[PDB]
Design a binder for this molecule. Sequence first.
Ligand code: CLA
Ligand code: CLA
Ligand code: CLA
Ligand code: CLA
Ligand SMILES: CC1=C(/C=C/C(C)=C/C=C/C(C)=C/C=C/C=C(C)/C=C/C=C(C)/C=C/C2=C(C)CCCC2(C)C)C(C)(C)CCC1
Ligand code: SF4
Lengths: 41, 51, 32, 64, 107, 80, 106, 26, 731, 164
Amino acid sequence: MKDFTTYLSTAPVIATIWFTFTAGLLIEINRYFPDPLVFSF
Amino acid sequence: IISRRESLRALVALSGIAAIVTYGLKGAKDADLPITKGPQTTGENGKGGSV
Amino acid sequence: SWAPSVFVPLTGLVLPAIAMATLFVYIEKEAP
Amino acid sequence: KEVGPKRGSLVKILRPESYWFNQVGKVVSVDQSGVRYPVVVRFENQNYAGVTTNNYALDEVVAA
Amino acid sequence: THIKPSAQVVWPIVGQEILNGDVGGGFQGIQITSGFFQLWRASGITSELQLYTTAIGGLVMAAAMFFAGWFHYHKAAPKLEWFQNVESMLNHHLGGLLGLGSLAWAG
Amino acid sequence: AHIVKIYDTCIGCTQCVRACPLDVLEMVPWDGCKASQMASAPRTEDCVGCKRCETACPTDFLSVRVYLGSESTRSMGLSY
Amino acid sequence: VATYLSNLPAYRTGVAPVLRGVEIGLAHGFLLAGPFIKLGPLRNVPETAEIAGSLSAAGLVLILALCLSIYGSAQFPLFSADGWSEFAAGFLVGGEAGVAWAYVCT
Amino acid sequence: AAAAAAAAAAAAAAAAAAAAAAAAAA
Amino acid sequence: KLFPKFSQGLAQDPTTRRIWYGLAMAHDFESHDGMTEENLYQKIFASHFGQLSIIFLWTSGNLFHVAWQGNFEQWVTDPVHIRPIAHAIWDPHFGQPAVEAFTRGGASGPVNISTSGVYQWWYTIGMRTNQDLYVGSVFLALVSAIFLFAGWLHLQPNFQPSLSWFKDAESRLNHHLSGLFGVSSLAWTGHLVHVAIPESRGQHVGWDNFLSVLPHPQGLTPFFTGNWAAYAQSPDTASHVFGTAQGSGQAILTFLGGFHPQTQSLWLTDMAHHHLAIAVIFIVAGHMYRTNFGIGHRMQAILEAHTPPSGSLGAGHKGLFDTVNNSLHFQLGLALASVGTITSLVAQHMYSLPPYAFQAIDFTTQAALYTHHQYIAGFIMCGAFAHGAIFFIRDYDPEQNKGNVLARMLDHKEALISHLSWVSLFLGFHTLGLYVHNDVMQAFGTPEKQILIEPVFAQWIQAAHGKALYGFDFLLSSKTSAAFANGQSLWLPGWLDAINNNQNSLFLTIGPGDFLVHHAIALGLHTTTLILVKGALDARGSKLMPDKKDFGYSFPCDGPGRGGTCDISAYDAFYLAVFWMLNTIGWVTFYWHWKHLTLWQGNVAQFDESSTYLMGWLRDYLWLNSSQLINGYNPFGMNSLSVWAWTFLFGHLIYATGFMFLISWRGYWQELIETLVWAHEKTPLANLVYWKDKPVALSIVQARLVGLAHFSVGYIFTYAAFLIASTSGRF
Amino acid sequence: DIAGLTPCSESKAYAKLEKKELKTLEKRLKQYEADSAPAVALKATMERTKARFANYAKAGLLCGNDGLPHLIADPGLALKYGHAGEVFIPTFGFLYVAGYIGYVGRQYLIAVKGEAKPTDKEIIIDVPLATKLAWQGAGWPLAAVQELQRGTLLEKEENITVSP
Ligand code: CLA
Ligand code: CLA
Ligand code: CLA
Ligand code: CLA
Ligand SMILES: CC1=C(/C=C/C(C)=C/C=C/C(C)=C/C=C/C=C(C)/C=C/C=C(C)/C=C/C2=C(C)CCCC2(C)C)C(C)(C)CCC1
Ligand code: SF4
């Protein structure tokens, strides 16, 4: 499955994994921090 | 009357003369051109709403 | 007073038709 | 003697109208005759026609 | 007559839960327009159990179709003169697909 | 009459002549290359300027070169 | 039809161009008056419906007669500098006659 | 037609000078 | 065969593009057959008489149709409620409801309401009667015939100028600064002080009694003695009535600032001291350059000697003079750059400082006069870069320009274009991204989550000019500052009363809707220059095509080779910018009009709520204000807006016809014409007819121009229909 | 009150618009039973809404004529009046992450050119290499300004030109 991990390491597959990472990170933050218009403390 | 080119060029141009110089006065039909009528009822109001 | 019913069919029907014609016959002259 | 650089040296192109101006490639062969443009250079950078090689003269071509 | 058809519900995160309108029927969601609820009353579904069992029947059928393209390309793929039997294809597609399909749906 | 002028960066691979759809180009002897040949355009009266020659030249900053000049009835590609 | 095209005056070579333009003039004479006399700006005036529409249609014949002579000075036994000038002359005289022939046919 | 004929009689002398300009330039 | 008398290479063209290119490169004098440089300058010089004789015939046409078909003598007495008249209508295609719906303004027949606003300009320069307007029309019609005859005579071989007469940049720039700018403005203050000042005070100064009326009651005695403040003793009061003597005043050169109280225009007296002051400076600046008398400055020693040390600017400006004096496209490109910016400066300074009486009360006049001189400024500014790009091909000489500042422009030319491409990309990301952020927050019902950045850097400037709405108390809002206290008798109290009035366009109050749109204007300015400066710099070549200078400025392409070179020329790099120009001037005029609609209606909060997000641009400015426009004609009836309703659909039609020449390109069409040629050559009885010029499809460069023209005409006619009818529909 | 403004805890059109939104939510809430999840969702929307207004007034956001939180993007008017969290804190909270993505993407391209064929490893991202540069690029301004001092950041006039 080394050839299968090359496919997982191509350009659009890493793009669609990292964008689910980065959106999915910002979605969970914007759940547990509702509406951050301004940097509070 | 006309049979050559330059005779026909004169007759078309003179027939364009004879229609248009009459069309301004005698040829403006009562039903065709409402601009060649009299001043009717109203219209001379402001542009509406505000200024 | 009779001007705007005469000069407008000149410039708009007649004088352009002369310019439709003379500026067309000039186009396809065979150059000597 | 053998004019031009060696068979496989790195080189820098100085032809200002070439696509690889100020750019580094490998000489592949230098033709030893009275040809105007003997020095054949291969590149990794392909041009807008996909052609990775060109002939250059002796003077448009500088080492390293 | 009064309850608007709705089958898409969004997640309440950035204020996008306002897209869950008051579609009626004790329910909030995007009012759909693709008319599946009119298929399903025409199919006489009447329960969300029937929709769930034919959704599992859809996942099963999709993996069967992915198997079939895998099988009929990688494992056992047809020859050229199989495809060039256009008499046999039209006899099967007019009779079996279109004919027996509308016999089965009438049933 | 388009202006086709070729240059000394020609290598004589005659791909421009084979690509010319109007026989504008032909191959003349010339000692400045290994193939001993350089193109020539004796028939630019017939050229349309469709530039299939300089799509085909391998040399960087194309050796053949077409300058779109004044168009006659043969340069506009007319059956009429 | 090879029979019918040898009848109508565009292809009658054995006719003088004056009579050629005269028959073409009247044929387009009492015909293009039709749309002006029926559905121009004066449909609903039952006295000017035949007057101004025919007078406008005679103006259109005057435009087409100039439009023919413009072609003869542009382009150059009709295809000549003289045979066309006799052709456009017969179209003007034949066309004005046919438009008056349209108003007669009331 | 006072200022019409006076401008026309001025345009007569203006055209006569134009006949001087149409010759003395070439 | 005969029509392109200038290009014999077009005279040998048997096709129908002979007609199209006989028209379009007829004024490209540098490429005509047998043209020499002495023959070049003489045809340009006579053509400038041709432009001048058209302008004065045009202006004498405006003076005639106002004097004959207009109501200027009726508009003088009541300049608020009586609407102006441009020229009466004779369209015999009209119907009777379309006669009586266009009779307005108290006139007899149908009329057009003049939105150009030449009444307000004429009423404040002293015109009162129609007999004063016919005299001005007959005067300019004489002067237009002078410039027609002058352009004829300055081509005649006795009167043809020498080649060195044109290159005398010393003597022209010495005469045009001092005479054409100074003496002209000195003479215009002569028209103001003698005529236009006392005409507002109710005193007829005509040609009969101008040698009898003293302009000032102790005239020419302060000028010869020295007490020039005697000319500003009793000015027009704060209760002056324009056109009468009621509270008149007697000063001729007052320096007040701010506005007249009735007209809300500039004072006539400081407009007299204005054009007097710059007349003195232009005459003094008109004695700078060394022509023939041993004194003055040589242009050949000011450019070349300003070279900074340590190689800051290469070889300095060394050698530019022979590339400005000999090149015309450099001179034309500078002139279109200068005029195109002082065309905006006309537009930016006439809504805020309206110079003519009862302007900024006539609202459609204000809308037309701003939008006109912004698109006129937009086209002139992109032509500066166009003829700047023609300079690098036709006129640039690198051997003449070794190392000057002009060649260092071409040297670091990628640093210019990539830093423009960063600024344009940063602005477009972060202006659109803020509007989309605001639009989503409007869509989710929560306007509080918007990004509303207050325009601090401009409100700081307005407070520094004297706007105490924001309370920065900085310079002129600061009452204990220096600049406030150095001018309380000089020029400030008129100016400070005029800003803090909330109902004029002098330094409008701004909020975050104005933050976003100035950055959008900045986007549109930086991107339009990105396209144009790239069109100038890469006019001589790129890595894709290193001999672009060999083809010329306006060529179609360089073939499909090298990946494909659609739109590679600097002409094709100029034309893309006209789209981004009309976009940009579309953004400045949407923002001008809609902030002024909400100002003039009174709902000044209806802008600031809705301008922060792009739906409010759509559903509150385009949707809401086009209500009475599109109702210009309906099956119920029609009104005075139907000529602007018809044009509004006429503008959409030319616009979309422009996409036909832009999306469809040439070669679909050339094959379609080849079927039409067949169907013409085989049709019986139409074979009598045959063409002379062979029908070919419009060329590639032509299709750009014809499509851009249909794009631009339909763009202009659409917005001008919306601008005039949305303003005058409710006003 | 900096530039004609007012605190949102002090303005009234802000509180009027808060009461405008909670009015719209409650007249939407009335159609459902108090146990129903279409009403549990709307009351959870309100408590996200009412806390949002409480938190904007807590931070001292500036309202104006329209009662909306206005931002002040100038240091010296945000540092002086306590508003660096509006723009001046996220203008460096961004530019940390921005140049981070730039530096990681830079170091991945620099460390791929010394290979056999580097175009293959722009399709097939070397994940053990790319994640290694991803973690260790967390001190990228500390590494960039050291590279800025050498002359190794800016490549010289080996760069490609047309006709200078
Ligand atoms: C009566 C028998 C029969 C039936 C029912 C079908 C049915 C179908 N054929 Mg078909 N075919 C047949 C005989 C048959 N074929 C024969 C004899 C040949 C050789 C000449 C072909 C050659 C052929 C080609 C070359 C193609 C098809 C395609 C299709 C599909 C059309 C797509 C569509 O409209 O969706 C209708 C969808 C459905 C009705 C869903 C139900 C699907 C059923 C379960 C599968 C079809 C029944 C199957 C043929 C019976 C064998 C079962 C299998 C386990 C062995 C459809 C599934 C096209 C296609 O989609 O390729 C996959 C296509 O490209 N057929
Ligand atoms: C003092 C003597 C003098 C004067 C008055 C002029 C005057 C003129 N020359 Mg000239 N010339 C002179 C000496 C002089 N020349 C000499 C000695 C030479 C040889 C070295 C030349 C060589 C020369 C050439 C080669 C050309 C001219 C041209 C012109 C004309 C300029 C075009 C124009 O009208 O724009 C004038 C522009 C303005 C008035 C606007 C700018 C003013 C301000 C800054 C703009 C904003 C304020 C604005 C006025 C407000 C408007 C309000 C209201 C009017 C709407 C103008 C008639 C050109 C021309 O048209 O040919 C006849 C031309 O091609 N000249
Ligand atoms: C001071 C003003 C000025 C002057 C003297 C020139 C002079 C020149 N320009 Mg330039 N230009 C200018 C301003 C100026 N330009 C501006 C403001 C722009 C930007 C819009 C340009 C953009 C420009 C380009 C891109 C090019 C030139 C070119 C030329 C040269 C050829 C002239 C030509 O093609 O005319 C002929 C002009 C026409 C036939 C007009 C074409 C049609 C236009 C768009 C008008 C259409 C209006 C439409 C019909 C409106 C009616 C609508 C209807 C419904 C009412 C000549 C040296 C060309 C050149 O030098 O080639 C190397 C060239 O390529 N110019
Ligand atoms: C509405 C139409 C439109 C838009 C958006 C643009 C946008 C742009 N043009 Mg322009 N252009 C247009 C019409 C338009 N143009 C037309 C009609 C012409 C005439 C042909 C031109 C001619 C033209 C030229 C000649 C030039 C430009 C340039 C630019 C760029 C300016 C820099 C900028 O603002 O970047 C900001 C860009 C955006 C905000 C758009 C991006 C949208 C988002 C942010 C992307 C991500 C969203 C999402 C995730 C993507 C979804 C896809 C997928 C996942 C489903 C930008 C891409 C210049 C350029 O390249 O400058 C760098 C340049 O030289 N354009
Ligand atoms: C391409 C090219 C070209 C063109 C160019 C252009 C087009 C330009 C433009 C330019 C421009 C368009 C510029 C502008 C400028 C401006 C400026 C530079 C400004 C400044 C300002 C100022 C300085 C101000 C000041 C002030 C203030 C602050 C306010 C108040 C007042 C005062 C004065 C104090 C040419 C042709 C040459 C050729 C070559 C190349
Ligand atoms: S130009 Fe067109 S025709 Fe002439 S050679 Fe090149 S390709 Fe063949």
